[PDB]
Design a protein around this ligand. Structure first.
Ligand SMILES: Nc1ncnc2c1ncn2[C@@H]1O[C@H](COP(=O)(O)O)[C@@H](OP(=O)(O)O)[C@H]1O
Ligand SMILES: Nc1ncnc2c1ncn2[C@@H]1O[C@H](COP(=O)(O)O)[C@@H](OP(=O)(O)O)[C@H]1O
Ligand code: VO4
Ligand code: VO4
Lengths: 282, 282
């Protein structure tokens, strides 16, 4: 059941398994040099995670082991916090939490953070398939039904709108880098150099080019460490939908009927009205 | 997936292909002098004796974390070897491997070991439900169909007969304790004192009493650490059949039709003809 699996937690619909032991996330102890990589689900977290990991590093363990998913928790089988506690510094932390739910210690230690977003319509499409692929998540009755929920913020991790706005505001901090999926798509070289500098490293052709080559869609698909094939089918059924699905901009055009798009875009307007964030023109 | 797509014959032993894909990790496993191996044929009471032994170690977390399942492996999500490599000594190792497949390092380091067996007919019954509960294991068409496979050793971990016989011979070693599920059922205090001494500890009446009270079936069935409820339903569906199912002797009488029992028992006699193992009369 949808609401048997998901429950509102502090104003944010969440996977009850991630909030059962919330005290572990709340009291999580951050380290000065921890780097937080935050995104709303399906905005390209895997992509920027690999880029950042490559920068740090100047049969490879799954990305979910290399970069622990902070709040991910499934009783005693899966525990991101446990992984992070045993991870040697500098730790790279992945999260989908809105600023209000992120462990306060990260803000307190003034940790560098990288927030990545993607245009809402394309997020909704990728998110829709994500729900299909996750065996324990009830499959939406249809894309439209799912979009209605997406607009209401009635999906895991809540409102995409509140998520982006809050993080955008947090990005006022020079230690919180705000990025766009579409910018990495339309101008990767620049975004990579930007990241390398934000992380205080010397950008060289060798480094930038190795990263660009290694992080292309085709390359990350085909990479077992990043395509999530190292993750049990009983959990993530990629037969339903692969993780590295399309990796393009504008897939919403193949899913949003005319009516829904106009309704979605109108709603978007109302939501992001007073938000100065600059998404790339399509 | 078909039965033989999931299971494959490995060095004469039908195995879960996921446990043999990276066999080199098991084969080259490095044992430590003080490692204690707890070996059993699936569904013979491994959880029971594991908890008893653990309690002895702590002088009165999920058990699969406290006592790593050596060869268990599911790509990068589950890895017993990885767990053991990070486990501080003295390590307690769980395994269902026949002596010929057990990492040679254990024999080389002459590690103490505890082998536990259960009467074949009751093992087959418990094993049958185990197959039903494991989501990724094809459910037998019927108990009979499953028993035919069991007699042929065409089930994960192979022939129960070869398993018991080989380990029985290995038990000649004073450092390899051979025990029976039915003995723990009919006389736990003795079996507990026996274990406490094998592990070189003092069998106080208080300690023995603690263990007996804590390792009863009714207790472990309600202990989340041992009833495997700390393990995702997507993997182990206890709704199909609970782990702590019955915990009795003779459940075969409720499953083996007359014909099958006579056929099974006849086969058993030819398989075990020259085995001096003393199974408890029931
Ligand atoms: N190197 C890359 N280039 C382009 N898109 C990528 C990518 N790596 C991951 N993605 C895309 O990011 C989405 C997964 O999101 P996340 O990593 O946040 O969970 C998928 O979107 P699509 O479903 O639209 O294809 C996936 O294809
Ligand atoms: N404390 C206990 N007392 C009696 N039986 C126990 C027990 N703990 C586990 N078992 C039994 O051991 C079997 C599980 O085997 P294993 O632990 O090796 O996988 C189950 O058998 P049944 O299916 O007959 O009920 C289970 O109920
Ligand atoms: O948004 V994702 O990186 O958990 O699939
Ligand atoms: O035989 V068991 O202890 O892996 O289920």
């Amino acid at each position: 059941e949808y609401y048997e699996v998901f429950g509102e937690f502090r104003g944010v619909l969440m996977d009850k398994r991630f909030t059962k032991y919330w005290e572990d996330v709340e009291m999580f102890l951050a380290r000065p040099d921890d780097l937080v990589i935050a995104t709303y689900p399906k905005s390209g977290t895997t992509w920027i995670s690999e880029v950042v990991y490559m920068i740090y590093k100047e049969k490879e363990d799954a990305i979910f082991n290399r970069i622990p998913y902070l709040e991910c928790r499934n009783e005693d089988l899966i525990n991101g916090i446990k992984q992070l506690k045993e991870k040697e510094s500098p730790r790279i932390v992945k999260t989908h939490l809105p600023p209000k739910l992120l462990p306060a210690s990260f803000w307190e230690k003034n940790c560098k953070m990288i927030y990545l977003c993607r245009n809402a319509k394309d997020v909704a499409v990728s998110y829709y398939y994500f729900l299909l692929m996750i065996t324990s998540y009830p499959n939406p009755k249809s894309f439209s039904e799912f979009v209605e929920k997406f607009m209401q913020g009635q999906v895991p991790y809540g409102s995409w709108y509140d998520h982006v706005k809050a993080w955008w505001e947090k990005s006022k901090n020079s230690r919180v880098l705000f990025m766009f999926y579409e910018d990495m798509k339309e101008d990767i070289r620049r975004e990579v150099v930007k990241l390398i500098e934000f992380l205080e490293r010397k950008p060289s052709a060798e480094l930038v080019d190795r990263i660009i080559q290694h992080t292309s869609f085709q390359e990350m698909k085909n990479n077992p460490s990043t395509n999530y094939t190292m993750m049990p089918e009983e959990m993530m059924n990629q037969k339903v939908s692969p993780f590295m699905r399309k990796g393009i901009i504008g897939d919403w055009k193949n899913h949003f009927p005319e009516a829904l798009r106009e309704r979605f875009d109108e709603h978007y307007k109302q939501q992001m009205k007073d938000c100065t964030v600059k998404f790339r023109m399509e």
